[PDB]
Design a protein around this ligand. Sequence first.
Ligand SMILES: [Cl-]
Ligand SMILES: [K+]
Ligand SMILES: [Mg+2]
Ligand SMILES: [Mg+2]
Ligand SMILES: [Mg+2]
Ligand SMILES: [Mg+2]
Ligand SMILES: [Mg+2]
Ligand SMILES: [Mg+2]
Ligand SMILES: [Mg+2]
Ligand SMILES: [Mg+2]
Ligand SMILES: [Mg+2]
Ligand SMILES: [Mg+2]
Ligand SMILES: [Mg+2]
Ligand code: NA
Ligand code: NA
Ligand code: NA
Ligand code: NA
Ligand code: NA
Ligand SMILES: [Sr+2]
Ligand SMILES: [Sr+2]
Ligand SMILES: [Sr+2]
Ligand SMILES: [Sr+2]
Ligand SMILES: [Sr+2]
Ligand SMILES: [Sr+2]
Ligand SMILES: [Sr+2]
Ligand SMILES: [Sr+2]
Ligand SMILES: [Sr+2]
Ligand SMILES: [Sr+2]
Ligand SMILES: [Sr+2]
Ligand SMILES: [Sr+2]
Ligand SMILES: [Sr+2]
Ligand SMILES: [Sr+2]
Ligand SMILES: [Sr+2]
Ligand SMILES: [Sr+2]
Ligand SMILES: [Sr+2]
Ligand SMILES: [Sr+2]
Ligand SMILES: [Sr+2]
Ligand SMILES: [Sr+2]
Ligand SMILES: [Sr+2]
Ligand SMILES: [Sr+2]
Lengths: 337, 132, 53
Amino acid sequence: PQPSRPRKGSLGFGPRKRSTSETPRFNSWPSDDGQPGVQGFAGYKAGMTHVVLVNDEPNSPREGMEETVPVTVIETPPMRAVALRAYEDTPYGQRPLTEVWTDEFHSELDRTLDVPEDHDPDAAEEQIRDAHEAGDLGDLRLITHTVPDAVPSVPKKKPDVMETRVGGGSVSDRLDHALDIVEDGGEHAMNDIFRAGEYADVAGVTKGKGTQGPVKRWGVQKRKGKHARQGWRRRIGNLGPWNPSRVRSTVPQQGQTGYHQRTELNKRLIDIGEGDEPTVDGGFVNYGEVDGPYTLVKGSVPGPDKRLVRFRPAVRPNDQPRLDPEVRYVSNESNQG
Amino acid sequence: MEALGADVTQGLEKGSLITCADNTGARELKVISVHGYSGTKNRHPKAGLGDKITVSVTKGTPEMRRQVLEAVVVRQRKPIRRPDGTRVKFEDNAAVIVDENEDPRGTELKGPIAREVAQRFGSVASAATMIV
Amino acid sequence: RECDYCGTDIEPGTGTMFVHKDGATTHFCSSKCENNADLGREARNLEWTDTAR
RNA sequence: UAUCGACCGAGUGGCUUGCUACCUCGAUGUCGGUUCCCUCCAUCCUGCCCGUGCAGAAGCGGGCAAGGGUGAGGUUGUUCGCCUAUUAAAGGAGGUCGUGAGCUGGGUUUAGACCGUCGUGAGACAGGUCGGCUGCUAUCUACUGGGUGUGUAGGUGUCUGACAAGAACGACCGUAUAGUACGAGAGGAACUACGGUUGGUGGCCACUGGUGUACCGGUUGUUCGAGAGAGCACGUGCCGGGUAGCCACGCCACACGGGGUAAGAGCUGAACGCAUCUAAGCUCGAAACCCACUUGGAAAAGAGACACCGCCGAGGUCCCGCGUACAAGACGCGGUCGAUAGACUCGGGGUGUGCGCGUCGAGGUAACGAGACGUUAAGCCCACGAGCACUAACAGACCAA
RNA sequence: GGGGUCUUAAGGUAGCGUAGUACCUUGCCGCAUCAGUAGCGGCUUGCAUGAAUGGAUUAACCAGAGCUUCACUGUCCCAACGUUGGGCCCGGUGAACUGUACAUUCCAGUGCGGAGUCUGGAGACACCCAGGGGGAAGCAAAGACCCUA
RNA sequence: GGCGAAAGCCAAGGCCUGUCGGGAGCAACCAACGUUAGGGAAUUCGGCAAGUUAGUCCCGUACCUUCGGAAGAAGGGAUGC
Ligand SMILES: [Cl-]
Ligand SMILES: [K+]
Ligand SMILES: [Mg+2]
Ligand SMILES: [Mg+2]
Ligand SMILES: [Mg+2]
Ligand SMILES: [Mg+2]
Ligand SMILES: [Mg+2]
Ligand SMILES: [Mg+2]
Ligand SMILES: [Mg+2]
Ligand SMILES: [Mg+2]
Ligand SMILES: [Mg+2]
Ligand SMILES: [Mg+2]
Ligand SMILES: [Mg+2]
Ligand code: NA
Ligand code: NA
Ligand code: NA
Ligand code: NA
Ligand code: NA
Ligand SMILES: [Sr+2]
Ligand SMILES: [Sr+2]
Ligand SMILES: [Sr+2]
Ligand SMILES: [Sr+2]
Ligand SMILES: [Sr+2]
Ligand SMILES: [Sr+2]
Ligand SMILES: [Sr+2]
Ligand SMILES: [Sr+2]
Ligand SMILES: [Sr+2]
Ligand SMILES: [Sr+2]
Ligand SMILES: [Sr+2]
Ligand SMILES: [Sr+2]
Ligand SMILES: [Sr+2]
Ligand SMILES: [Sr+2]
Ligand SMILES: [Sr+2]
Ligand SMILES: [Sr+2]
Ligand SMILES: [Sr+2]
Ligand SMILES: [Sr+2]
Ligand SMILES: [Sr+2]
Ligand SMILES: [Sr+2]
Ligand SMILES: [Sr+2]
Ligand SMILES: [Sr+2]
């Protein structure tokens, strides 16, 4: 009577098309609780190595013992928060109200957008504060951009720009926090947002794999035994029943597999630092050498090396934070081998 | 069951023939079932270092042969991973027959035993000659 | 720790430990050492091993 | 009336069987299986409940409930069913008894043949048995992915969120609770907090594993006279090792909580002065519903918002070096205001100790000599990194409010 | 077949027997397996075995049918990587099948009771590339089954 | 070369006419192949497909049998220079 069986692949990550922006775009932010503060950061993927850590789970039998942990090295130099865009609540959700810019811009931001030559930071700030008075102010977010020039392993110089929400205490104190950050020049660091041992959601555009069939793309079986020899090795049984006379979009079919955006929940930040302590002998394969601001994320991170990844305070953590894990060892052994 | 303390890649399946690392009179055991396991369509129910399995005696004294008994996997060829990353594997695949209360049925155990098995069936481990 | 075969230090969080039939324990730094060891070769007889050197 | 439940009576389904002969004989391929997708509820498990011939533990029966799950095997073509060990449970049904321009071809059901029975015979059998074929370059439509245009109506960058998809999560074991409540005893819970496993899901490659007709080595036959170095032996002669990369057998991640309800537990409360969970009103309460979370999404015709740049020039195309991309197209990066690609040199790696020479070498008058040691951590090689403008990203053409 | 002969002459002897013959039937007992509608051994009342319509039995032989064991393995758990030729892009060459018309469909209904074309809604900007084949009761051959003449 | 009119390699002789080419680390998918950890027929009507074994010498070889056979039974050992 044909045994039951879950369907092949999830219907929640589609359509499985190529990503629109190689740069990730979070679709949710953390809750407003602590003092004000930017709710995200970004860097470029370099590669992996492992680390030896002192278990610190109060409920683990191994608490206090050496434990090897896989880690992804993310180069995270300082970014620039160039503007303060405010949103207003309208009958059709939120809409961009206005933006507040700075004067000092990175020497090469002119590779992506048209840097402002004549702007009015007060006329805007005024419009924003008037809005806040009327009570029509939706969240406040900072237009943010990276400085890939600080990263030699990345060929590009043209910055990657992304909006990052600002969350915190009261909207008023928050708006003032935002405005100060921008006014400066915008510059801020991973330190400013994250502390080692906290959980962060990492978003990124996965590695691209061009077109692939149902087996690899959806995880369908390969024909078995005699069926694998008569002319069909990796083609699903049928596109559907006689009726409905049409192919449903749910039947696993070939197509774009990879280069999709994925937001990976609760990634433990093992350590934030700067320098070349986590580099690998011979250099990270297909990347280069690390020697600057970096982050060690526990586990894997979507995308190939050199791809821009985004950090965000975990929105649905399952564990309480155990700050500053004790890193007893960081492998520097060549990855070639 | 209590956590093993190592990650295991099941090296056995329903139907696998393995050594009976004890002196119950059973020389070879055939895996029939894995206590507490539920697989998925078309998948052969698998077993590995640490599991409690139901077994039938294939080789041994006439008195033991054909009997369906419970056992514990004590050694396996496919590697297992320990907290510190090191992998560990054995020369053969073995299981010790055990009773209703999980106490070894035989008097002596033959060959080494993974320390991990001690975190479940202590009475089995406390009959081991060598614990690796 | 040292690789019981060629004798080089074993990169932490790496290697395998083969548990002999009698209980003996052999740590291998790499698959290469285990494989030469299977061909019945003696670490001493291979010029590329720290043991040999 | 916990539970079981005859007679008789009233129905619902369209899963079995039968009836009919409406459709199809200028063809709608048959059973079973398989693969892959959706669904139904008369619910097997899981969640929340009620009753008990409910102490407990466990049953038994009933209610809401279709989110998820419902597996592996032995005979048999079997469907069905019988049997075994696991399991939370291993529920049933619809989709042309879903699924042959998808597979299989074991059963059925041509042509060969045997047996039994029947027949004077040819031959037959709603009996058994061995053998016995599976066509086609997709026009339309459908969907999975990818492009070019037009519309909205100069460009760059960032957004919005109408709608859309999701199971992104389901389930189990174990420990503390606790040998506690309950019970004479035997036996033996729960709330809650933890650890883990399993099935499912998305991703990744430090680790283990696979590959690796890059590469290095060993060696058989034969040809180039020997040596050295090579070809052929099928897309590597065979064998050993294996970098990158790709991978799983490896590794990482996948809530908590709100809101509204069902069954049900109740409050206040009248009709009906009392009573009454209900009629108005209200407090609660399901794995289910909505949100939360992830993915898509300005062609959302109300065809969107913001900021800046520009309208003689912002921006773009061609061109050139390339890949974080790729079947075309598309996408991304660099272009001397430069490390984009290559050469070179270091580094980091793979093999495993080169050619030649010297000594040794069982022997042999000698010639000759398989092989050993040294030179030699050697030689050969690298899909990686760094340094480095030496070479090549030149020269230059064009659109543009 | 009946009883302790009757039809129609005789009334099944030696064997063999749940058979390539046994409907009932997965017969009952045993072996073997965790579990065996299989296989083998025994029993055997044989629906409906049986002596040249040859019976029984049989060493050797066999691309003949069924069963079991050892060994081995990607058949499978569960798939991965690689090789060669295609596939994809470009020059050149260059067919066929098929075509009442119209045709961007979908969910329901209706209808000769199995609709892209009828009804009601829903959805739908056009064109192109690649794909695996759900539908066109797809294409192919005036169904060979069945009945009728 | 070897038992060989076997394989494989190479002469004499013949040929590049089993007659369209050019591009893309060259995707999905297909044909024909190579390699796959642990498990080892669990797959399937059925081990179908693939694989295992393999040449030669020595030792050794069961039931059964028409005394011919079975038999290369099976099993074990050796093998270069
Ligand atoms: Cl099982
Ligand atoms: K017909
Ligand atoms: Mg590596
Ligand atoms: Mg290593
Ligand atoms: Mg199956
Ligand atoms: Mg007709
Ligand atoms: Mg119901
Ligand atoms: Mg059918
Ligand atoms: Mg069909
Ligand atoms: Mg067909
Ligand atoms: Mg066809
Ligand atoms: Mg006679
Ligand atoms: Mg089966
Ligand atoms: Na079928
Ligand atoms: Na359900
Ligand atoms: Na069955
Ligand atoms: Na049909
Ligand atoms: Na000759
Ligand atoms: Sr079906
Ligand atoms: Sr969104
Ligand atoms: Sr065929
Ligand atoms: Sr239809
Ligand atoms: Sr209902
Ligand atoms: Sr229940
Ligand atoms: Sr039956
Ligand atoms: Sr057939
Ligand atoms: Sr128009
Ligand atoms: Sr407990
Ligand atoms: Sr007790
Ligand atoms: Sr060759
Ligand atoms: Sr060979
Ligand atoms: Sr109520
Ligand atoms: Sr628009
Ligand atoms: Sr096609
Ligand atoms: Sr010649
Ligand atoms: Sr020609
Ligand atoms: Sr190889
Ligand atoms: Sr089999
Ligand atoms: Sr089977
Ligand atoms: Sr032999």
